[PDB]
Structures are given as C-alpha cells and as structure tokens.
Write a protein that binds this ligand. Structure first.
Ligand SMILES: N[C@@H](CCC(=O)N[C@@H](CS)C(=O)NCC(=O)O)C(=O)O
Ligand SMILES: N[C@@H](CCC(=O)N[C@@H](CS)C(=O)NCC(=O)O)C(=O)O
Lengths: 221, 214
C-alpha cells in the first residue's frame, strides 16, 4: 500500500518512537520534515493534524492521529497482521497478555519519560541551541531516574523483556530516550553499568528496527 | 475485584470511576503509607513502584491507573457502559479517536494540573506551605492545554465526539480536584465549552458515586 506519513524530525524521541513502531510492524512510511525553526509546527495547517502544535503528527489512508503512544497503539491494532505480529502481545494470551505490556508502557510515559527527557534536553540538546546546561535540573532528575531504573533493574533480572520472554511495545517505547542518554551524554553508565539494564539495552538496540531509526537520525537537526 | 489505595488519590479515583461505568463490582482496600504498607514485599508484588492504586481480579494483577482502565474496558467489554472505549463498528479508527485524548490527559493535562492540586489542596494539610511560584508556573502550562481543549469541545460534545468515553473519564479526577478543592475552578468555568463539558460529565452517576466514596 501507499506509505503512511510521520511528520517531524527523527532526532525527536517522540518521532523516533513512531518510526520504530512502523518499522517493527513493517508498515511502509515516509518521514515528512517540519521546519520548527520557522514555526511550521505551530501553523494553522499543522494544528489541524496536531492540536498542540507538537511533533510528531501521523496520517494514513483512514485517519490522522496525534500523541506518539496513541499513534503506536493505532499502528499495532490497525496493522496487527503485518511485520512483528506479537508487538502488542500474543493472540493466545488475550487481554491479560496486553495488560502485562500496557502497565510498562504506562511506567514509561509516567515515571521514566519525565526525568530522562529533562536530562536529555539539558545534556544532548541545550548545548547545540545556544543555551547553558542547568546542572541543578540534571541532578534533580538523575535522582528521580535512578529510582525508576532500580525498579527496572530488579524486574529485568526476572524477565528478559518488560513483558517477559518476548519483545513488545513496552520495550519499544523506552528506546528513544535510552538511546539519547546512552549515545549523546556521559550518563550512559546509568544503563550500561547495571547488569540487567545493560543486557536489555544491548539486545533491543540491536534489533533491525532500531538500527534503521539510528540511520534515519543521521540527518542534520 | 480489589482496588488498593485511598479514594482521594486521583489515580485511585480514576480506576474506581472506570469500574463504576463498567458496572464491575469491587472493593477498596486501604493502604496505610504511614505504616509503610506500600513498601511491603506483598504490595510491591502488585505495584513495583510502591505507589497506588494497585489492582487485582480473578485473572491477573495490573498497575498504573490508565493501564488498569484499559484492561477493565477490554476484559469486561460487555458489562455496564459498553461503549466506554468506542463502538466495534467504528473499528480501530474509532479507538484512536479516544486514545489520542487519553494520551493528551496523561502527557499534557496531568502534570501541570496535578502539580497545582498538590500545592493548593494537599501541601497545606501536610504541614507544608503552598509554593505559589510552582502553582503559577504550572497554571501557565495548563492554560495552554485548556485553550486547545476549549476549541475542540466547541465542535465536539465529548473528547471523542458525540459520545462519552474513557478519554473524558481520565480527565475527571484532576478536574474535580481543581474545581472543588482549589481556588482555580475559574480555569474551567470561564471557558464556556469546558464548563459545559464539566457540568455534563460530573453529573454522571459514576462520578457522583466516586465523590460519595471520597
Ligand atoms: N507528548 C507528545 C508530544 C511530544 C513532544 O514533546 N514533542 C516535541 C518534540 S521537539 C515538540 O513538538 N516540541 C515543540 C513544542 O512543544 O513547542 C508525544 O509523545 O507525541
Ligand atoms: N502513575 C501511577 C501512580 C500515581 C501516583 O503517583 N500515585 C500516588 C497516589 S498518593 C502515590 O501512590 N504516591 C506515593 C509515592 O509517591 O510513593 C498511576 O497513575 O497509577
């Protein structure tokens, strides 16, 4: 079928999250650049796709969706039979299996994302935007992040992936921010020096979907 | 079906409202944090973060309010309000029309509104002084969100369109907090479409029951 469209810069964790999901589900797509320096993401035309004036925006042959995690859920259910058929769980496990995945998707959006994103902005983006890194913000959020990682470290010592024996959207949603911290800051050790998290990252970051996302991010931002 | 935690917690209230709309019988089990009951190995088995609410039924256990709500809507799809997560006829597209606003609630609406509610309605009762700088900083972020909602609700009766859904429900706990427990009710009542929306959803029997339980 014709390629669906994701709007925004690949360096954005939210945009990368959607791209990764489309790749896992083998859904042909094209990335439409949005000139944020010219405020294109705030234009009346863009607001019809994304009411909050933020990226990414998503559109396929049937509808438009906003919010990276809602977009991902849509892709997984609309194109369930494509690519990785178990991204949102094994059919055999039904709703109970989906819940085992959803709780960690929520952990990502509610506990992991806030502090990791704050850190990433201060350390990986600010330095290139003519802004000074706020060390107080970094320190405060690192403490919050470590608390979440302690929970994950314990969990991943009893589970290969967040949902157990198989990779799922639960693992995928955590990848964009983890990649940012591991590859673009000196905080990589928070992940790579913790036995279970290190194993998990080494495994998931090697998947072809993520390898392609990294390749797509090798564009000027 | 057991929900662990205090009804005053908006996260617990969110789950209760969902169970009520789905007409699923349940009991609320108190979690005494002053006794460190949220840090016991038993509670941690249900909630790895030592936070509330915790949820358990005869089939499994789930944590995080929005995940618990999605589970309830899928597992008990035929109970109570059968359209809480959309109509089968509208397919996955119909589900997405709801999901995007549930995400708006969790990512854009929740952070600033919860920060405000804490400083204004909880910090005091905890012997702490209200930090008006944090309140105002978060109010600015919330206003941006409410202005988007105000425009949307001018063309839609509910977040997903002409029918009430989980997208509306997830916004209720924090809205109730600000409207009834703080001096920030004006943020909603001054915006006609948001005011209409709130007056309508807060009148639903499920929410009236949650308020009674609180
Ligand atoms: N919570 C949304 C939004 C993500 C987000 O924060 N997008 C940023 C990427 S730079 C953005 O557009 N920022 C511009 C702004 O807020 O004006 C999601 O996960 O899709
Ligand atoms: N994001 C989770 C947890 C929400 C949350 O922060 N719950 C509070 C209710 S008081 C809590 O248990 N706080 C205790 C703590 O921070 O340890 C959800 O929606 O269930």
């Amino acid at each position: 079928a014709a390629p669906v469209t994701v709007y925004g810069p690949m360096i954005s964790p939210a945009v990368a999250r959607v791209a990764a999901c489309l790749l896992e589900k083998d859904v042909p797509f094209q990335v439409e650049p949005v000139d944020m320096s010219k405020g294109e993401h705030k234009s009346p035309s863009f607001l019809k796709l994304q009411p909050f004036g933020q990226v990414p925006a998503f559109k396929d042959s049937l509808t438009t969706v906003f919010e990276s995690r809602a977009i991902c859920r849509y892709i997984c259910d609309q194109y369930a039979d494509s690519g990785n058929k178990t991204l949102m769980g094994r059919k055999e496990d039904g709703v109970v299996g989906r819940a085992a995945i959803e709780k960690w998707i929520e952990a990502e959006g509610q506990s992991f994302n806030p502090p990791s994103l704050a850190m990433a902005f201060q350390l990986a983006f600010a330095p290139f935007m003519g802004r000074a890194t706020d060390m107080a913000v970094v320190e405060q959020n690192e403490a919050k992040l470590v608390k979440v990682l302690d929970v994950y470290e314990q969990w991943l010592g009893e589970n290969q992936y967040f949902a157990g024996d198989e990779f799922s959207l639960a693992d995928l949603v955590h990848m964009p921010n983890t990649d940012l911290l591991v590859r673009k800051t000196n905080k990589a050790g928070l992940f790579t020096e913790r036995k279970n998290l290190a194993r998990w990252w080494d495994e998931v970051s090697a998947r072809p979907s993520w390898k392609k996302v990294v390749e797509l991010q090798n564009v000027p931002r």
